[PDB]
């Protein structure tokens, strides 16, 4: 009953080499900011038309997704494996997992105190409206800020959080994959490092059901990236919302 293995040299290197990974592509400091595409919040206490009629928030917020999405796949390229994978299926995890990535490492920054995400400077806040500015509805908003709570109190060790990412970028049953078995195995070796970091580092433990907890999340996340792809279409639906985008955001998401 009840076995915690030590973490093998192999687990544990794996877990440093996420660990580092993560350090050189996520800024706490948010130092990058004043690089992108300024945040214009126009008063709109409703409007589904003013919105899509500004779309004032777009600019600075497909910028910062445009951003964080070269920093995920930096992340991705120093996951150990990751190399070993055809380029091709390298782009499709990539691609179909980018935006679910960066709702998990997002809470780094998302604060319950005001339930937003605070990346400033009051700027850098970002709140319920300053999405729907964006060109979002509440059917995706409102689901996000409790997935993010929900992952707030999982109170995940860094170690975990990294892991959970990790696994999460590398999944077998993404549509588009062609060696479906060697992504699988990768993430198996990630998986089996989660639950032995569980078992063996985490208080109490009479709950190593914090697993079970983790695994849930990641199919939340698979509804949001479809919930979050239905909104993006009626986006690219507004004239002149490609230049208020990137080339990047375009390419992936379109
Ligand atoms: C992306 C991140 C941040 C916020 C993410 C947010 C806050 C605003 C609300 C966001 C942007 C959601 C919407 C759906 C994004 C929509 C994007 C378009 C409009 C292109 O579809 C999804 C993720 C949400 C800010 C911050 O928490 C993190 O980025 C910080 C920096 C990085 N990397 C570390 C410096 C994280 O990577």
């Known amino acids: 009953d009840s076995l915690r293995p030590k973490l093998s040299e192999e687990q544990q290197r794996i ?3 996420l660990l580092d990974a993560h350090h050189k592509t996520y800024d706490p400091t948010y130092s990058d900011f004043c ?3 300024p945040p214009v ?3 709109d206490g409703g409007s589904v038309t003013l919105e899509l009629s500004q779309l004032s928030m777009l600019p600075h917020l497909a910028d910062l997704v445009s ?3 070269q920093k995920v796949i930096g992340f991705a390229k120093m996951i150990p494996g990751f190399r070993d994978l055809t380029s091709e299926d390298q782009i499709v995890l990539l691609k179909s ?3 679910e990535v960066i709702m998990l490492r997002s809470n780094e920054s998302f604060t319950m105190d005001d339930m937003s995400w605070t990346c400033g400077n009051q700027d850098y806040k970002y709140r319920v409206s300053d999405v729907t500015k964006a060109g979002h509805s509440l059917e995706l908003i409102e689901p996000l800020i409790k997935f993010q709570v929900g992952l707030k109190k999982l109170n995940l060790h860094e170690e975990e959080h990294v892991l959970l990412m990790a696994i999460c970028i590398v999944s077998p049953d993404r549509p588009g994959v062609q060696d479906a078995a060697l992504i699988e195995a990768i993430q198996d070796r990630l998986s089996n490092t989660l639950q032995t970091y569980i078992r063996c580092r985490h208080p109490p ?3 190593h059901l914090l697993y079970a907890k983790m695994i849930q999340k990641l199919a939340d996340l698979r509804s949001l990236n479809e919930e979050h792809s ?3 279409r009626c986006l690219s639906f507004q004239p002149e ?3 208020k985008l990137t080339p990047l955001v375009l390419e992936v998401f379109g």
């Open 15 to 17: 877990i440093a080499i």
């Open 35 to 37: 690089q992108f595409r």
């Open 41 to 43: 919040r126009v008063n």
């Open 67 to 69: 951003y964080s999405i």
């Open 97 to 99: 997992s980018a935006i």
């Open 205 to 207: 433990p009479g709950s």
């Open 230 to 232: 239905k909104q993006y």
């Open 241 to 243: 919302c490609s230049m």
